């Protein structure tokens, strides 16, 4: 009786949300951007090839200086690269080799990683002993760690396969805030440029907008037909794009609270592992299981280019803060740096 | 056209390369085993004889080092991390023989033996384990012999039309799991009957892994 009444109210509220979203959907992003000129063909060349990983690479993250990057591979090594000279700055042996995510602190003094061990380990790069050592091990997740992003040297937000996200105080090692509401494994998270909000993508084919300070879900975004694997904020922080197993990339707007564009092609039938935007947000770069990275025109939903240089699945990618280059990691155990030429 | 500090940075990078190469060669000589199975299937008893989210066990047997990975505690979606074990030497799958007339505690209607068969075929026929051999352990042999006298195998297998003896019932169950192999050319299933007091389980794994090592050597050398 009471339980039956409540579940009917949830359906009515969902209908109210759907009608409200349809009310404000006066036009389409494709119609608005129909007039603008296309970006043409985007051609990029492999400037650098980062060799040294002897297993599949699952994660990479650029530093804020747009020169240092960290890569996570399941050979049990966390490697920090000098992308300019391909020099290996550090090689961090991991206690658990089943690492699925890695992060670079915006200060550059710390890197994080975590995988099937359910632990987010914080590594100190600036020590008086001259070696990289573990500063903290963040325990409390009951599922594998799928993504993590530093807010500062003391705060980090992590997502897990236990359907929850957590905000941690690194000094104390405890999760100050827990983000619940996903009904499937959370696979990715992306911090807003102001680090006041972040979006997460889970296996329930939904994306959620979270308030970091308040600790509650603000908006929920649906539309994908399968697990969301990648998520990335637009540069202005008013939109984000997701990558899912249904071979589609979709763009959602926070203020519109609805999907604005779908980035799909008939020849593309494989899952999407990683998504990232260019500096201006005009280009949406996505990694796929078909061993390629496709460049998308975010405003016009046209494939602008293809980064085909990997012999296995492209598992990760990232664009530098200055937009100068894009790095792609892959299961073929290589990282490549890409940029265009005049 | 490097500076004095650039040259020393390159020298540091090559020292890192030397240690990465050393670690990879050490890692290539090690045996990685993905230990799978259902609950109360004797899977934990296997670890006890071979002394977070994933439990990793290391043991050395006859100049060979084994890495056994237990993913029983990972209650998340298997398909999101099962591909992380693509490349293991083999898979050890534990099946409780005595759990044929029993039913799942939660479902209360699905047979425990069929639950193992359903999990066995979703792992054996998985796309990430196309050519990965399976070391199939059939545990609780002594308990199965006691139960077969009272509870016939026809409760689990209605199509079974053999004698109500261990020597024939155990063979029928062994063939049922092997018949689930959807690719009988790229992989082989090594079936062993273990128990709670057996001491030849580690010896069997060494024999089965040795065959996998030979098979991979033949492929790399071009003979196969």
């Amino acid at each position, epitope marked *: 009786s009471e339980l039956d009444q409540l579940r009917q109210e949830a359906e009515q509220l969902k209908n109210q949300i759907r009608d409200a979203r349809k009310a404000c959907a006066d036009a389409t992003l494709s119609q608005i951007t129909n007039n603008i000129d296309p970006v043409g063909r985007i051609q990029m060349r492999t400037r650098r090839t980062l060799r040294g990983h002897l297993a599949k690479i699952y994660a990479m993250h650029w530093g804020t200086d747009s020169r240092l990057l960290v890569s996570a591979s399941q050979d049990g090594k966390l490697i920090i690269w000098d992308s300019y000279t391909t020099n290996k700055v550090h090689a961090i042996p991991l206690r658990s080799s089943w690492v699925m995510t890695c992060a670079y602190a915006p200060s550059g003094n710390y890197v994080a990683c975590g995988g099937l061990d359910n632990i987010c380990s914080i590594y100190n790069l600036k020590t008086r002993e*001259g070696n990289v050592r573990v500063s903290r091990e963040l325990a409390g997740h009951t599922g594998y760690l799928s993504c993590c992003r530093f807010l500062d040297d003391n705060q980090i937000v992590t997502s897990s396969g236990d359907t929850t996200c957590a905000l941690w105080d690194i000094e104390t090692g405890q999760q100050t805030t827990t983000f619940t509401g996903h009904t499937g494994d959370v696979m990715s998270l992306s911090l807003a440029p102001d680090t006041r909000l972040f979006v997460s993508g889970a296996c329930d084919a939904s994306a959620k907008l979270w308030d970091v300070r308040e600790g509650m879900c603000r908006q929920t975004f649906t539309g994908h037909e399968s697990d969301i694997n990648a998520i990335c904020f637009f540069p202005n922080g008013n939109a984000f794009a997701t990558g899912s197993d249904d071979a589609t990339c979709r763009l959602f707007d926070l203020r519109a609270d609805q999907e604005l564009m779908t980035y799909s092609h008939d020849n593309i039938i494989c899952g999407i592992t990683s998504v990232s935007f260019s500096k201006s947000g005009r280009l949406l770069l996505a990694g796929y299981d078909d061993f390629n990275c496709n460049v998308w025109d975010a405003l016009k939903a046209d494939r602008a280019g293809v980064l085909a240089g990997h012999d296995n699945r492209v598992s990760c990618l990232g664009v530098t803060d200055d937009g100068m280059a894009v790095a792609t990691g892959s299961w073929d155990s290589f990282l490549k740096i890409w940029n265009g030429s005049s | 056209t490097l500076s004095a*500090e650039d040259k020393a940075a390159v020298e540091r990078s090559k020292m890192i390369d030397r240690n990465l190469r050393e670690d990879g060669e050490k890692a290539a000589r090690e045996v990685k085993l993905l230990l799978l199975g259902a609950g109360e299937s004797g899977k934990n008893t296997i670890v006890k004889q071979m002394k977070t989210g994933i439990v990793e066990t290391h043991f050395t047997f006859k100049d060979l080092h084994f890495k056994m990975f237990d993913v029983g505690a990972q209650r998340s979606e298997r398909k999101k991390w099962i591909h992380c074990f693509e490349g293991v030497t083999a898979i050890i799958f534990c099946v409780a023989l005595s759990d044929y007339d029993l039913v799942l505690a939660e479902d209360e209607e699905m047979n425990r033996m069929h639950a193992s068969m359903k999990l066995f075929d979703s792992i054996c026929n998985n796309k990430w384990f196309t050519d990965t051999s399976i070391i199939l352990f059939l545990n609780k042999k002594d308990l199965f012999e006691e139960k077969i006298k009272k509870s016939p195998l026809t409760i689990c297998y209605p199509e079974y039309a053999g004698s109500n003896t261990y020597e024939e019932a155990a063979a029928y169950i062994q063939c049922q799991f092997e018949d689930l192999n959807k690719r009988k050319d790229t992989k082989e299933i090594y079936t062993h009957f273990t128990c709670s007091t057996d001491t030849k389980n580690v010896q069997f794994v060494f024999d089965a892994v040795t065959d996998v090592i030979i098979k991979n050597n033949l492929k790399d050398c071009g003979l196969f």
Partner: single-chain antibody
Framework: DVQLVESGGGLVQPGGSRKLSCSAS????????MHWVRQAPEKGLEWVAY????????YYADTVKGRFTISRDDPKNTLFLQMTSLRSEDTAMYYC??????????????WGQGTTLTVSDIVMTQATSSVPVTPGESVSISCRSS???????????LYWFLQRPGQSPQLLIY???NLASGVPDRFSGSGSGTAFTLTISRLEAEDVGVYYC?????????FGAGTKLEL
């Protein structure tokens, strides 16, 4: 804590041989390149020899090449300087210096206390030998080089060291602009090309000492004469 202890110094006869040892503790010794830098009595700093991490690269000063041998024992965390045919020119306090080389690192960050041995090329110029100073007053120290220390990679390999009286040299500025860890922000390094300036705002008592500028553009590493601040 990071510690470098030198031993083996003492009075020797001319033409003899002496062995210097440097004991390292509190840091990853095998990951650091090691230097020997000597200082003759009432004289400036003089670089002697360098052995890289892993013993792959070795450099010597011309005044000591052929007679001095630098070696390291990574398991025992010890640095060695075997010296032969010792002359009166070799009478100096020898320092054990650690330096690690990767992108963004700070070489020459830690110096040993040094051992005294008694025996019975880019030019760095610091014209101003002494500067009368008062607390709370801004002081600028100038350094010059014969060759431009700016490299094509964008770095200007100029280092500043402060040797307080009775103490080992202390790194202040590395690569001409970056502040070493643990150094107050009042120290600042500025320069361009061949001329460089070290600015000390709100001078204090601890800032009293001799300031050296070293170049790391190429070997041999050379120091300036040294600018002394006195009250």
């Amino acid at each position: 804590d990071v510690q470098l202890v030198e031993s083996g110094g003492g009075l020797v006869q001319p033409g003899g041989s002496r062995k210097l040892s440097c004991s390292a503790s509190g840091f990853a010794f095998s990951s650091f390149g090691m230097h020997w830098v000597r200082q003759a009595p009432e004289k400036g700093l003089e670089w002697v020899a360098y052995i890289s991490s892993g013993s792959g690269t070795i450099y010597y000063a011309d005044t000591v090449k052929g007679r001095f041998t630098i070696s390291r024992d990574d398991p025992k965390n010890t640095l060695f300087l075997q010296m032969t045919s010792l002359r009166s020119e070799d009478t100096a306090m020898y320092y054990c210096v650690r330096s690690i080389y990767y992108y963004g690192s700070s070489p020459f960050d830690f110096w040993g206390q040094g051992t005294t041995l008694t025996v019975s090329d880019i030019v760095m110029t610091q014209a101003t030998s002494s500067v009368p100073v008062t607390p709370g007053e801004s002081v600028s120290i100038s350094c010059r080089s014969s060759k431009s220390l700016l490299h094509s990679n964008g770095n200007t390999y100029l280092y500043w060291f402060l040797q307080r009286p009775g103490q080992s040299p202390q790194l202040l500025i590395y690569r001409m602009s970056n502040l070493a860890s643990g150094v107050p922000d009042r120290f600042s390094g500025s320069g361009s090309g061949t001329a460089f300036t070290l600015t000390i705002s709100r001078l204090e008592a601890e800032d009293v000492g001799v300031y050296y500028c070293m170049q790391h553009l190429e070997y041999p590493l050379t120091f300036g004469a040294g600018t002394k601040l006195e009250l």
